[PDB]
Amino acid sequence: MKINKLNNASKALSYPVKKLAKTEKAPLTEKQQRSKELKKFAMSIAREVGGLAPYELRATELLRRDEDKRCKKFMKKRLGSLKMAKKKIELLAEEMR
């Protein structure tokens, strides 16, 4: 059997290359900026025209009573992900302020 002869320490070694730095892409052109602005704008109009959904109302009500941990549990069960819940709570909080 030609397997499992080296230790983990010696398997971790590596050859000394010379690396190339990554080309950063930070510049964003004028036309790309206007494009992003118009999309964010459109998102405002929808919220203005049609308002909040039932679970969003129930959530925001709990935030007024400082029921932070109840709101957390509630949102987790509605959206599934604990990450989506943490994000949606932060967006709702900012809307109320």
Partner 1 sequence: MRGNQMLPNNHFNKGSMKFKNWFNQPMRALKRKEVREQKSKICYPNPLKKLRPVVRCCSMRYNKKVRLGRGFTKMEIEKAGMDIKYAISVGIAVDLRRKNKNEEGLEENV
Q: Which residues bind Mg ion (CB under 5 A)?
A: 4, 14
For partner 1, give the closer residue by CB, 18 or 83.
18
Instruction: Report helix angle 68-79 to 54-64, nearest 10.
Output: 160
Q: How far is the CB of 19 from partner 1 (least distance, A)?
A: 7
Q: From residue 91, give the alpha-carbon distance in Å to each of 34, 85, 86.
A: 23, 10, 9
Does residue 70 interact with RNA by CB under 7 A? no
Q: How far is the CB of 4 from RNA (least distance, A)?
A: 5
| Sign, CA torsion 96/83/26/45 | negative
**Mask for 22-51, x = binds RNA (CB under 7 A):** ---------xx--xx--xx-xx--------
14 known member of a binding site = yes
Contacts of 95 (CB under 8 A, 6+ apart): 60
For residue 42 the two structure tokens come to 């459109």
Q: Which residues bind RNA (CB under 7 A)?
A: 1-2, 4-5, 7-9, 14-15, 17, 31-32, 35-36, 39-40, 42-43, 53-55, 78-84, 86-88, 91
